[PDB]
Amino acid sequence: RFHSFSFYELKNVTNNFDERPISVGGNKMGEGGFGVVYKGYVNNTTVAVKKLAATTEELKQQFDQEIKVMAKCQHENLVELLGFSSDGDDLCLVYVYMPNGSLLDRLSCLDGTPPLSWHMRCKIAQGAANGINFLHENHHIHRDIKSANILLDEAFTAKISDFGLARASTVMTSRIVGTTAYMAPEALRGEITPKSDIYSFGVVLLEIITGLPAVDEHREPQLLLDIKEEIEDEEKTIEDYIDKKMNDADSTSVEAMYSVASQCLHEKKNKRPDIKKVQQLLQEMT
Numbered sequence: 001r002f003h004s005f006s007f008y009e010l011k012n013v014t015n016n017f018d019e020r021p022i023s024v025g026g027n028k029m030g031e032g033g034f035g036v037v038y039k040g041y042v043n044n045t046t047v048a049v050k051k052l053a054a055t056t057e058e059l060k061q062q063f064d065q066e067i068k069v070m071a072k073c074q075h076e077n078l079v080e081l082l083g084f085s086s087d088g089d090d091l092c093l094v095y096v097y098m099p100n101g102s103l104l105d106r107l108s109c110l111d112g113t114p115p116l117s118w119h120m121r122c123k124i125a126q127g128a129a130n131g132i133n134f135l136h137e138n139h140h141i142h143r144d145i146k147s148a149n150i151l152l153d154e155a156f157t158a159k160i161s162d163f164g165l166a167r168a169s170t171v172m173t174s175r176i177v178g179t180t181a182y183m184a185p186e187a188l189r190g191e192i193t194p195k196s197d198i199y200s201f202g203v204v205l206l207e208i209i210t211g212l213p214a215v216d217e218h219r220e221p222q223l224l225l226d227i228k229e230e231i232e233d234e235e236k237t238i239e240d241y242i243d244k245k246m247n248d249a250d251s252t253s254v255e256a257m258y259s260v261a262s263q264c265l266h267e268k269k270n271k272r273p274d275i276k277k278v279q280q281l282l283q284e285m286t
């Protein structure tokens with residue numbers, strides 16, 4: 001299904017895993033908790049090489065998990081796996097490179113990219129939803145839905161990535177994983193449910209409206225989730241939080257997206273809409 005690489009081929013393609021940023025002529029594109037992503041070229045093909053970095057048996061399990069899911073799931077709103085490398089202690093995953101990186105980076109204008117327009121942010125949300133929907137229809141729960149995991153191609157097509165924590169099929173776990181700033185309350189407890197993915201997507205929709213990261217240690221309030229409490233308790237409005245880095249954001253569509261986000265952000269798992277409803281609401285928005 002996927003091409004098996006030898007770890008040395010990948011050392012060659014990535015200029016021996018150069019840690020300098022791609023903007024400066026290096027190879028580093030970014031990093032998560034489970035690894036660092038590098039740029040490369042395999043047979044004229046631009047690739048993204050995720051070098052897994054830490055426990056070892058859990059990492060191998062997350063590596064095998066990404067491969068199993070990717071083998072089954074192929075969609076226009078999902079990232080594409082070309083191959084991998086499991087030669088010794090180093091575990092690598094090779095993907096089709098995303099010319100526009102992550103939604104997180106584009107929302108912050110990392111490396112001087114222009115701010116995304118409202119129209120583009122809407123199309124991106126619509127893409128992301130179709131991706132979550134395909135995974136859900138295929139009985140998969142992502143477990144790590146966040147803007148760092150919503151990637152963008154040359155046309156700004158949303159592509160869901162990082163399936164190392166993905167699960168099949170409400171169950172429980174002894175190892176709590178994900179990014180706390182996006183995690184549904186039950187997920188923080190240890191519950192595994194597709195409804196948690198809906199909550200995480202609502203945090204993403206708030207990032208899309210505001211241009212603010214879900215968590216910022218140097219910000220009051222540190223958590224973007226707290227901003228919804230301020231709006232709900234009539235102390236502020238969504239208008240006070242609309243990203244100032246855009247000019248084409250009209251209040252009707254902005255409030256319409258906030259409505260979807262607040263429905264997604266229901267405290268109670270069963271009160272949240274399902275993905276097909278989220279898609280319907282987002283399509284209605286435009």
Ligand SMILES: CC(C)Nc1cc(-n2ncc3cc(C#N)cnc32)ncc1C(=O)NC[C@@H](F)C(C)(C)O
Pocket residue numbers: 022029030031037048050079080095096097098099100101102105111113151161162163
């Ligand atoms: C690590 C992250 C944040 N950035 C990327 C990630 C990726 N890809 N592409 C596929 C892919 C899959 C995973 C996973 N799981 C992780 N990363 C992946 N491709 C590309 C970029 C990437 O930065 N392109 C560069 C782009 F942003 C530019 C030119 C404006 O500077």
